[PDB]
Design an enzyme around this catalytic site. Structure first.
Site, PDB file in Angstrom:
ATOM      1  NE  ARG C  32      -3.452   2.224   2.887  1.00 27.11           N
ATOM      2  CZ  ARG C  32      -3.322   2.849   4.049  1.00 27.11           C
ATOM      3  NH1 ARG C  32      -2.405   2.464   4.924  1.00 27.11           N
ATOM      4  NH2 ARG C  32      -4.109   3.870   4.334  1.00 27.11           N
ATOM      5  NE  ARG C  73      -4.440  15.292   5.610  1.00 28.10           N
ATOM      6  CZ  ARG C  73      -4.021  14.383   6.477  1.00 28.10           C
ATOM      7  NH1 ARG C  73      -3.964  14.671   7.766  1.00 28.10           N
ATOM      8  NH2 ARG C  73      -3.653  13.188   6.059  1.00 28.10           N
ATOM      9  CE  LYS C 217      -8.776   3.424   2.846  1.00 28.49           C
ATOM     10  NZ  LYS C 217      -7.965   4.602   3.216  1.00 28.49           N
ATOM     11  CB  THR C 275      -6.951   0.323  10.492  1.00 23.18           C
ATOM     12  OG1 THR C 275      -6.760   0.798   9.163  1.00 23.18           O
ATOM     13  CG2 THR C 275      -6.689   1.430  11.486  1.00 23.18           C
TER      14      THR C 275
HETATM   15 MG    MG Z   1      -9.161   6.034   6.547  1.00 24.84          MG
END
Ligand code: MG
Ligand code: AMP
Ligand code: AMP
Ligand code: AMP
Ligand code: AMP
Ligand code: R5P
Ligand code: R5P
Ligand code: R5P
Ligand code: R5P
Ligand code: OXL
Ligand code: OXL
Ligand code: MG
Ligand code: MG
Ligand code: MG
Lengths: 471, 471, 471, 471
Positions: C32, C73, C217, C275
């Site tokens: 990745r 962000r 995702k 994750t």
């Molecule tokens: Mg993410």
């Protein structure tokens, strides 16, 4: 059209002009020649009539030679026939004599030596019943306990009495010889009681240099005690319920039938269910509710084939009997073709692949399952599963089309011996496109093998659209 | 001993001295009184003989009054009987006349008005068959297509012809009245074709101030089209295969039987399978292989009860017929009592609890399942499940013991009306300990309710050892 | 050797000399590239190192370009980093400014107009938590409820707040362009919330004239609400548990994972679980018992691939992390490779045939399942089933070997484009005989199609012994 | 509300003023007293705080005394603590000395005698790892292979080294004595490796004249090798994953957990899953995605109870840890309470009846299952089945309410000792009607026994409407 196969017995009632033709046209898949009755002229003429009808209609028709086996029979009466009335004393001797009412001979020479007082004697599959009072030197003194008529050479049964008699009689060996030379497709042996009984049949076949599939007729306790071994040594089995239902308690037969059908299918062997399925249609144009039920239940049991004995051989409605049996089978299969599941996952290459072939066909709503077969084995592992899809056997050996006439749900196609799998698939397209029912584009699943024309070589499944370039 | 129940039909052959006694001693659970035949004297004398035999043996025996229904019948012939030969013209008129060979009356006065050319006429449950040529004013001209003998008042069937006739005939209402006063335990209605047909039976019962369980006889397309509604409105069902097998294609009956048994059991109603199960035993001491099979398959289908009609009513071997039917059922149940599973998890309090009761019994290898029941409902939700454990119904209502005579696997015990659950359990201990077969310590599962003597009150399971202090 | 595939994330910790090599040698199946971090030099150098390691080891290694998506962000702080203490008031503005401790920018310019008092703000995937007090013109004043450190450009989450932002940001389109030209094998899109999000990815791919498989995702409620539609429109899915576990209640994630894996496999799409699987191995040489459990359970859930994020990207034990994840997967599969059954019988030609292929393989104890695939589809319908048999994909398209690196249990073999099925089988024999593991005679099941090099043409199963004349 | 039970460990972080109260109010079902740490003052004060909280809230809270067992530990360092750096030589002696960096004592006096070169040494459940170089007389020379800090009396593990040490240490016997007198409800034994280890616990209990349920902690290969025998001899089991994951390969633990839970439930014994379920919440207010997964999977595995160790004992968020664990369990059970089926049909009276009770409850949509229990056995055979229905244990023995605090899905009710089943049902009505939640009319299923107050007497199920006259 119908999946379950119909076996008919030939005799006086199927000798009338073009009646064997009428039977085939009405759906007879196998013709039983019963060597208990008739002359070799009678058999030849009947066998001729079947080959003509088969070839003239293009309906596959197997010819089954049923061998009398070590059947025990009464001698001759001075009168040809007498009446045995409830309460009368009868002597049955192993000595030579022309019989009369109170003293008659039998074929079994070991009767004096093997029959003890209290032993029961059923005549003509149960109708006249005696009990053994005394054995005096060569004579067996009996009391009629159920009364009725007896004639020359009428058959008897001594249930539970241990009978010593060769599996093949001298008469059977000559009937077997005659039948192999005549060109019969299968042989049925009466009163099998050991798996080794097939070795003696094979011995004769090897002398004559012609083997056909050997059907074990199940009608003895020793047969059911050895059901598994027999089903493995023999090529098919018949539940012969007439003799089975006097040699065993008649109330035990229903579950023996069910257990014998299940055993046949587990090992991919044909099973016939035989005798009195439509007994009342000998005299009557419609059957009993019991009879209708008996036939429907033989289908749901998973029987490859149902048989008619007296219904076709001597009956008044041989045609109606076949038509009626056909309607009942069709009624059941319309609802569902489903059979009792197998109690084992297939382990042999041909079992696993035929199982897989069924799966792919049904799930893809294919128009046909097609299997290429030299011995019929690969086809028989697909038949036992009972798919509602047409099952089309492709073979180069014409005899195999006659052999598969008694395998469930199976139409057979003769094709040239091919040298390639692509060739087999071109053959399928060719053969199938002749029938209106199949068209170019139609999806079919094809089972095949390599190297071709090798038994147990089956190793390939091909999902093919008819006439398309997908090979 | 046997679980499946045996229904016998009384008539001429069960009138000879102490023959009804012999039937009960041989295992008759229900006695069918067929009101198609016989005088009220004949019925009374028969009903007496059943009560005596039941009370003298202590075997429960239900008495079933079978009502003729709107049966269509031929008139009288000048000769009493004629022969109708294949090829002959016959007139069947709605006009009054003393018949002869070519012109006879029928009971159906709507025949001229409802019969069109091409309509089929089956006589005596199929043997003689005609086709309708013409309807000329009041006469119906037919051609005999299958030939045979006809007599006074012989029954006919017009398959698929829409027959307008009340559910209860005036004669049925008098037979029903007679039967309710005589003390019969259940009533069977011929030719049911709507769920509302039970309302008219009930109406009569209410006038007379006596209700018994009403059996719907299934022998019409309208019945099978409405199978579910009928099974819910009626208290039991009979698969009446004689008439069903001429009113429907005879090849359709096997699966209708199976579907009707499954429907009965899903709704906890008794189902009888009827007619020609052992037809050939009218003339013969042993049945056909088909007949043996038919009975075995009725058992595995999950039938509460199998019936004999002519086998006991007019047959030569009424006793052998009952004994033979008993051996076959016993043969099957020895192997397994298992029935086709139900296609629903029980939802009603009595279903859930009886299901649970079976579970606890079988898993703990109990000697008996015991259920207390006022209407028999709680017992019938356990019966339909077919456990190999003895099923013992406890009731204060003697009629309920006679009613449960046609429920699978069930022996009934009459006990005083109890006012406590602990009382019911003391009753069980007392009743059971009288029998050799049960002893102190023996493990038993008891189903009961409170407040006692209230239907649908069942709310309790008790695992009890006989005579021990565990309440 | 191992069936379940391992995805590693590249970053600072995998930039050391030969580290990317060490990862591949330790079992990295997919690399990745996280476009949230690094410049194009860093990515190029990393992508180079993967292709070399893949080609040098002959281990397939897919390269996955992970696109940041519309991630929200924080701006820049005057200090680079500040400390947000539990109890402090903080302003987050949509206005341009240099960040002070108590006033900072964000990238989301719709914040003022979308954030209402009581709204929660999770920072750095949950560790620092604020609540929205007031929105004053362009400013969003919040109270730190869980205290901690924040730095430049740290990511935030506004759970349940409706975020308006294009599926592809301007910067994603340039990262996607860069990645397609660089030669990546698959593309992952962050924060998918509609099935149509793939249309915009495709649009860009079409302009550049290069399509690769697009991974959705799953890390938004809208994604799970539309799980089925998304799984069908996209080529694979990743359960992205970091963001999913702040955007949903963290206690909801375990069952969403399970239900998303099941959805992937039903439709024959790859699923990655991502994750914190071994989070603690960032700092420690062994994981937690929870972490070991989490990995084992992802395997039993039926995940094609497990991913490491920080464990490899920034961690102290990137190698140990891969080795450890490998041991756990292997421990589970040693016991059983079994997956939760599919809730549907396959209906597509390729599903039915691959299912059948598995059956024949397992039942015949074949040494390998072999499938020929152009798009990988036929292989992916066999993978989802999870057989313990080796699964060997044969393809002429080298990219497909890289694509199948994230498909369960699958080793891939590049072969010349064949013009015949017999050619494909000769290829298998040749490729497989190079490996020590396979010998002449070894039994293998081969899935193939015609006309060759056509997608969805798969229509053939062949049971082949290696080197033998059975075609 | 929640079915799965939560065990919390008391220590420094649960000594702050009414923190133990806060834990109980947040859902702590069992309080673990870990006798590895604290003095008897600390334990007394904690045990007091639990009894008060339990009695003040009316929440059942079991108190579990965890005995250190034959734990191997390092001696004392001159410094209290040193740093062991990767590459350093360390001596661990069975000789008496005040340790320093190079040379320290251990409790295991058989170390010199049992440790051979190549043996591995894990410290503090894995963080610092050594390998044995040499055994010189009394000293064990090791090389630090993974570096880190070690302190006085830090625990070590010698995986695969055969440790001779009594099942109960002299310190354990005094802790057990102290704990039995203090009034703890259950006892947990560390490092069980034989079924006979319970005999020694019982011996001590018998001397002191007080038995409580004995939990076997599974954390040794010998334990898993003897899992079945241990689960049968002991009253519950704990999967102690900390030590289990160093004494076995950490990758083996996930399946041992699953197999040990299944073994517990088959034999109706409580199983706790222990250690690092939410490890990261010692430092952080939210857990890892792995941790969330680990807890969810322990629930679906069928664990009676999940435990927190350091999360509550020394952690920064003991409250959040309990609340978080509670939310996860609740999330899973909302979806389904379903557990892996049992691989055997229940055979014991109490198993069969509790199984039946569940069936009746669920099928009738009862508001509660109620079981009367003296030992808790009858209740525990219903708990293992995992019904979504409330499970309410009724008992006269207050300790049994504390014991059932670690049994799945179970709330307990203390009632007077009854002398009748009708009494037990009156008790139910009375207790249940106090709660708002239950009303008159509501149906519940009640399990009971006779003679009352006799263990294994359970023999009765009663479907009861609350307050109605149906007994
Ligand atoms: Mg993410
Ligand atoms: N017409 C044919 N030409 C060549 N081989 C055939 C032909 N028909 C059937 N076979 C072979 O029959 C074999 C299967 O035999 P069996 O195992 O007896 O079914 C397959 O390998 C086929 O190649
Ligand atoms: N001998 C009896 N005395 C009192 N109640 C009885 C007796 N026998 C059956 N019952 C009741 O019959 C009810 C069940 O009736 P049913 O719902 O018709 O099965 C239960 O409540 C039983 O208590
Ligand atoms: N090396 C190859 N040469 C020709 N066709 C191939 C080759 N490898 C795979 N295929 C084709 O891949 C197709 C399967 O496509 P898919 O549906 O994408 O799996 C099969 O029909 C094969 O014919
Ligand atoms: N409060 C009680 N008073 C009398 N017996 C009880 C009470 N609670 C439970 N029992 C009995 O304890 C037995 C169940 O024990 P066990 O087999 O240990 O569950 C049954 O006989 C219950 O009726
Ligand atoms: O003659 C051999 C038997 O027929 C087989 O061994 C048996 O039938 C197993 O066949 P499958 O594994 O194909 O069911
Ligand atoms: O008359 C009512 C019917 O018998 C019921 O509806 C049917 O029997 C279903 O009840 P269970 O749940 O006891 O099968
Ligand atoms: O992209 C399409 C989907 O993957 C299929 O339509 C679906 O997966 C059905 O495939 P099968 O019937 O082979 O499971
Ligand atoms: O201690 C005894 C065990 O718990 C039983 O032998 C075992 O649990 C079987 O009990 P059931 O048949 O009730 O599951
Ligand atoms: O009523 C009957 O028994 C019949 O119709 O078969
Ligand atoms: O004892 C414990 O809890 C462990 O070892 O994890
Ligand atoms: Mg015979
Ligand atoms: Mg009738
Ligand atoms: Mg421990």
């Amino acid at each position: 059209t119908r999946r379950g196969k119909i076996v008919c017995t030939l005799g006086p009632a199927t000798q009338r002009d073009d009646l064997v033709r009428a039977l085939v046209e009405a759906g007879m898949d196998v013709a039983r020649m019963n060597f208990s009755h008739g002359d070799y002229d009678d058999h030849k003429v009947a066998y001729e009539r079947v080959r003509v009808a088969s070839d003239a209609t293009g309906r596959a028709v197997g010819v089954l030679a049923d061998l009398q086996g070590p059947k025990i029979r009464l001698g001759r009466f001075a009168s040809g026939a007498t009446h045995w009335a409830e309460g009368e004393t009868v002597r049955i001797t192993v000595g030579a004599c022309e019989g009369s009412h109170d003293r008659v001979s039998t074929t079994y020479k070991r009767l004096a030596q093997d029959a003890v007082a209290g032993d029961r004697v059923l005549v003509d599959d149960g109708k006249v019943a005696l009990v053994v009072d005394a054995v005096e030197g060569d004579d067996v003194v009996c009391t009629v306990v159920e009364g009725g008529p007896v004639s020359d050479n009428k058959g008897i049964s001594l249930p539970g009495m241990n009978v010593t008699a060769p599996a093949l009689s001298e008469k059977d060996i000559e009937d077997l010889t005659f039948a192999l030379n005549l060109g019969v497709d299968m042989v049925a042996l009466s009163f099998v009681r050991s798996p080794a009984d097939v070795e003696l049949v094979h011995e004769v076949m090897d002398r004559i240099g012609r083997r056909v599939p050997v059907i074990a007729k199940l009608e003895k306790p020793e047969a059911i005690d050895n059901l598994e071994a027999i089903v493995l040594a023999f090529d098919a089995v018949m539940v012969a319920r007439g003799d089975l239902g006097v040699e065993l308690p008649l109330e035990e037969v229903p579950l023996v039938q069910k257990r014998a059908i299940q055993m046949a299918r587990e090992n991919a062997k044909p099973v016939i269910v035989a005798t009195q399925m439509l007994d009342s249609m000998i005299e009557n144009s419609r059957p009993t509710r019991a009879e209708a039920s008996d036939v429907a239940n033989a289908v749901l049991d998973g029987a490859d084939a149902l048989m008619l004995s007296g219904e076709t051989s001597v009956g008044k409605y041989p045609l109606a009997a076949v038509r009626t049996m056909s309607r009942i089978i069709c009624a059941v299969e319309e609802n569902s073709t489903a059979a009792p599941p197998l109690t084992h996952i297939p382990r042999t290459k041909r079992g696993v692949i035929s199982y897989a072939a069924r799966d792919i066909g049904e799930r893809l709503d294919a128009k046909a399952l097609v299997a290429f077969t030299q011995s019929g084995d690969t086809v028989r592992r697909l038949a036992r599963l009972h798919t509602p899809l047409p099952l089309l056997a492709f073979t180069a050996w014409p005899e195999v089309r006659s052999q598969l006439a008694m395998t469930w749900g199976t139409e057979t196609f003769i094709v040239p011996k091919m040298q390639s799998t692509d060739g087999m698939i071109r053959q399928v397209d060719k053969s199938l496109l002749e029938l209106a029912r199949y068209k170019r584009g139609d999806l079919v699943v094809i089972v095949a093998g390599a190297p071709p024309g090798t038994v147990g070589s089956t190793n390939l499944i091909h999902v093919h659209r008819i006439g398309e370039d997908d090979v």
